[model samples]
Target: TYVDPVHEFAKELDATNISIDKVVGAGEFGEVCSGRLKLPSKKEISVAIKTLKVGYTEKQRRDFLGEASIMGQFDHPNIIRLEGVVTKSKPVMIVTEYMENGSLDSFLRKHDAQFTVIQLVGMLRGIASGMKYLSDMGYVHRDLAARNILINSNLVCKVSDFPIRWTSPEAIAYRKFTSASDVWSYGIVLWEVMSYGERPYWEMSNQDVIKAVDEGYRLPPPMDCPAALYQLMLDCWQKDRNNRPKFEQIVSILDKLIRNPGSLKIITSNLLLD
Candidate 1:
């Protein structure tokens, strides 16, 4: 399947040194422009150029470089691959594989297109696989949110947006990101996938979320979510970080859930479907 006109244009105009041919998708953070990449022998390739905004400080520049460097070293099929990084330009940038379907939230939120529980299990497996690879490599993705999860045309999930925390004092100190934090974000991503883009706390403000969760409140029972899976979600949001399951343990439990979901009793049977 071919991309639409706008995306096609983006694919053709964002290449380096080569003449730009078209504009594609634009976003608040940057514009994804596409163009043909030409080698010394005129070997042509399609590439997208993701441009960062101007006015970044020296520390911000290093953070951007770290993001690119980390992505370049990642070779997993389920993680977005970074092709190259450019710093000589006005706003330094990184080149990555293009995702036509956009973020995980956009695709799953489409009318009648929400993923079934089974499909979500498969997605979780892909995410876990990616996380396992990253953890094995000694890099933990700090900001593991839904917007950072990219879906390709094949509906394969790629975990992107590994933020570099150069300027953040504590982040630099503790390398605050551990394997446990990644697992926490993975559960939140699952929540996003199952809810079809519903905000985690539709009615609560940030302060409310902190207060309530600090006191042990989580998202109400999910619609169409089996009881076993709901419990898994609650286990993920455990107030004590050490109480959370490891990603490997999560992988085993998810495998079990997908293979034998009927075995689970609906603990939140009191809640009705919308």
Candidate 2:
């Protein structure tokens, strides 16, 4: 008798729940697309669907559903919510909530700098809060970047990704990714936030971003970016992993800044706590 293990960790939905529309992008398993899912006793909702490509083996089936196993545990409001999974039908799919505002990078790219300093900090703070939850759960997101973060219409930011520009140098060189490396990646995300989601290390190829980070060059502050915020970004980019702030520390630091919006008026970093 064969038993599917991921079934224990994920919600197995009926194929009738999903209505796939079009392919948007591809991941390791296959192309992901936008679609609609109708949860029982609720209104139909937009969802991001991950479909396993054909010509798969049993091993591939397990891994495909395994992705749902991981996302199924997240209960944080800031992280994208897992709607359910379809393992009983053709094109087995993992369905998750869709963000109306879309990727944080893309959303920021469309907006102006009119938001007050606190408003910007509010977005960054929400992300730090999300990471704090993820970190305490003993999961190092390994990949955290602006493009990976999705924002809902309410504007909460979530963590999820792998990109060369945002990866820590140690991880890049040694292939070792830890929570500390996540902290390094957070720095690039901070830069992207302050820059209204402009390209990191602007106009530089991925190779150049790697080269500059190795040469002790971190991204500079963006237009009208607060000094304290940039200093926090620098702290996250510390060369020594242990020297970087933990997600807990980052959450509280941002909290203090949010509470004291006037502190951003200073030229030097302020209200930064230990």
Candidate 3:
């Protein structure tokens, strides 16, 4: 029987070491805040801490810390690094590397047009590489959206968040989760990145999104989105989930684009990569 090693993987942290700043995000569990971790060696480092609310029930506590369990198993550079957890204190928390630029969606939207097409592709490539690693390890990210991707000081994108409630059509209709479903979510992430954080299916209700997707309506390419990249998004949105390309294939495709920028530009503008 497979067992969860949440206690095993997470180092026990003293709650006093965590000094919270302002809240960055919030959920049912509690708030996620940027903070500083003061270690025993007197070393201090900036961090992001997720805290479970004061009166959380046992089930709520388990579900909140479950993300720490899932993240503790991963160690890829493109994936968020878990520092540890504080469970023996008043405010239970999960600490992680602080992302300076914050979520990829807001970052991209805030600095629109500041990045070159190549830089944007590089960000997507990093995310795809992270997903490839997860898929290889038999893990599926049900929520693979730009908002869940964290951006560091160097603009490196790292995948974050865990155990998403929103999932694929198959997951919704049949409670199924596979690498293929992740590909569907990846398509939405592509749209978010290309459009600089435009809401997916703008103005459409949740039920309408399902109906439209079921009827073969894929999102249109964003303004000035490279045709080649847009084509890959369409591929990920294939009606037959199995028909979608795997993350490994996605990494390879992105690798080729990065190595041979000409291919990425040739299909869009007449300007050749020099």
Candidate 4:
């Protein structure tokens, strides 16, 4: 991986062959440095270089190594493409398409009240489509939060920052994340999109939030969220994991909403995502 935080140039990767620019992205994992690659044809195309966080454990290393492997499973417009993996030295790295808009959470927070219901629903449909494809592949995205979602300049949604597993498949199965859990998390993402990216449990503690959710403490009414959307979110957060709606069902509802969003009725009653 590229060290020398002060100097963003990549030595091992033929620095002269490319023109380094500015830092464009960052998250829990690390930052993305954008640069221009000048090919023999004199074509200057932009690319992002992702560096992994330092001080990762052996388990973390295995997870990072397996990221590209798992990412190779699915390819779609809505899902972020894992271009390649960098493993020349101690700290590994991942290369992917650069998204200029950053995380969905950040975007919504920056442009909260300006968003209309139509715009938000359109974004949700794209997200659900990506998730449906992932579910069809039998891979559960253990983490499905807005922070992990990136919105590109075209307004297309691509999920990133997968939580890789180090344990055996069998062990991971025991602690396995199901589509239901992902859907539960997706409900939170939905809330973020609809509510302009408010943090979950704004006033509640983590323990308090968990306890309240498990005990069926529903979220208070959102400013302008429609009833149909609220009902769908509640189904996603059902108490019995088995009772949760499948990604296919989720896709269907979201698709329906996209076609005739005018038909959506405001939910007068309260419900929960616990």
Candidate 5:
């Protein structure tokens, strides 16, 4: 019987070691803040800390801390890094590496159309690389969306979480969240990248989105979306899950596009549907 569920991976830190700077956003548990963390070695580093709210129940505590275990298992450049956890004190916290550019969705929105096509592809390539790593690990991120990712100034994008609108048909209908479904979501994120954070369905309700996909409909390419990239997006939304490209394939193709950059210049007929 495990007394503390997160003890397996959560590195419990002394509460005194953390210094919260300012609240960045609201989290499921409580406030998420950008803070500084002092390691036992006396070295200091920047961090994002999610605090458990006051007067929480035991189930809530367990739920909040469990993320640490999942996050702890991943160690890759494209994945967000987990620092440690603060559990021995009140308002338990989960600490992670502070992302420099913040969430990719907000970053793209703020910069809106400022980045060049190659640079946009660079970001998409980074995201695909991260998804490939996850797929290799056999871990399925059911909710892989632009808002659930983080990026940096190097144009490096990382897989963060934890999207209904970004889900695959099988996932929505049968709850099968496999790597293929993840690939589907990746296509949506690619569209987000090309459109500079435009909403996927453009005023359509969630129910309508599901019905549309069920009836053999797919999102049109974003304005000015490269023909090659848009085709890749359509490939991701293939009605049959088995028809979607594997994450490895997605990454390999993106790698080629990034290396050549010229293939994206060919404009195909924008009419995707007959």
Candidate 6:
């Protein structure tokens, strides 16, 4: 059953207009590639195209493109912009603005020590701003992690990757998602950023992660992590979702840190106790 609203948000793009150059990444149900979108107006722009993999089911395709409708409605500098979709042709696709620098995780790992603490905080600020906008719009990202954040040529990070599945306990058990859950995921993002893109919960299985989190076992502060930023991460990981600061509050805290980088230096004595 095709909804009218889906049609309203997604524009049908001709497949020929897009020229896939190379495979840049892969998605949950598709391959993401960098390409050029040639418009009839004689204009061209670099784009990332996500196309349904061969032999996908109708239901999978529908679910894959579902985010396109949501993305089409958003317009923010820190959020990836949807260019359009190719639904009328084989292998339906979703197009978005291409980020030359790729994902935040890989970017940080490849260029460790290249960014100062302030520069790292700036990236976090951009992500928080994007989350705040999504929160104001009444949408929860459900999945927010370092891999979901993309960086561009200007060193600006934008939030991407909409998850169709929720694996968190609150989400799986109750089928719930709110800004609070996004906050929890943001805490993981903080760990990833401060750790220079190290994987969270190193070598822990999914079940282990769930059990550890339930037991109040939070991640230790990454080496060289700023105390203020790690404190914020701990706050976001609070068991009581209600107590977790809102995206607006997170943005405010980061703003203060950016304004006074000296505050980032005050080390919490019990850094790993949290």
Winning candidate number (lDDT) = 5
> How do the candidates rank by lDDT, highest first?
5, 6, 3, 2, 4, 1
Question: Per-residue CA lDDT of candidate 3, range 1-274, in tens?
Answer: 1133487667788887888887878866998788899988989999998889988899999898888888888889999989899988868889998999999988888987778788889999999999998888788877888889999999899999862223566766686889998987887888788878877776666776676666776777777888889889888877788889999999898898899887766543111111
Q: Which ten residues in a row have the lowest lDDT in candidate 5?
A: 265-274
Q: What's the true lDDT of residue 245 in model 6?
A: 97
Instruction: Write down the TM-score for model 6.
Output: 0.87
Better of 2 and 6 by TM-score: 6
**Which lDDT tens digits does candidate 2 get at residues 133-246?**
777776777778888899887777776531688789999998878888988888888888988888877677788777777878877778888889989999998988999999
**Each prediction's TM-score versus the true structure:** 0.74, 0.85, 0.88, 0.77, 0.92, 0.87
User: Any residue pairs clashing in model 5, and if so which?
Assistant: none
Residue 244 in candidate 5, Cα distance off native in Å: 0.9
Top TM-score hit? 5
Q: How many steric clashes between backbone atoms does each model show?
A: 9, 0, 0, 1, 0, 0
Q: Report, for every candidate in turn, its global Cα lDDT versus the true structure.
A: 0.64, 0.80, 0.82, 0.67, 0.83, 0.83
Clash pairs, model 2 backbone: none
Order candidates by TM-score, high to low: 5, 3, 6, 2, 4, 1
Error of 6 at 6 (Å): 2.7
Q: Could you tell which candidate, 2 or 5, scores higher by TM-score? A: 5
Clashes of 3: 0
Q: Where is model 3 poorest over a 10-residue stretch in terms of lDDT? A: 265-274
lDDT of model 5, residue 104: 94
**TM-score of model 4 vs. true structure:** 0.77
For model 3 the TM-score comes to: 0.88
Query: On residues 1-274, what C-alpha lDDT tens digit does candidate 6 reach at each position?
Result: 2122356777788888999899867778878788999977969999998889999998898888888878877789999998899987878899998999988999999987778889999999999999999888877777788888999999899999753112344765576778888888888898889888888877666776677667777888887888888889889988788899999999999999999999988764122334
Model 1, C-alpha of 231: deviation from truth (Å)? 1.8
For candidate 4, list the clashing residue pairs, or say none. Answer: 227-267
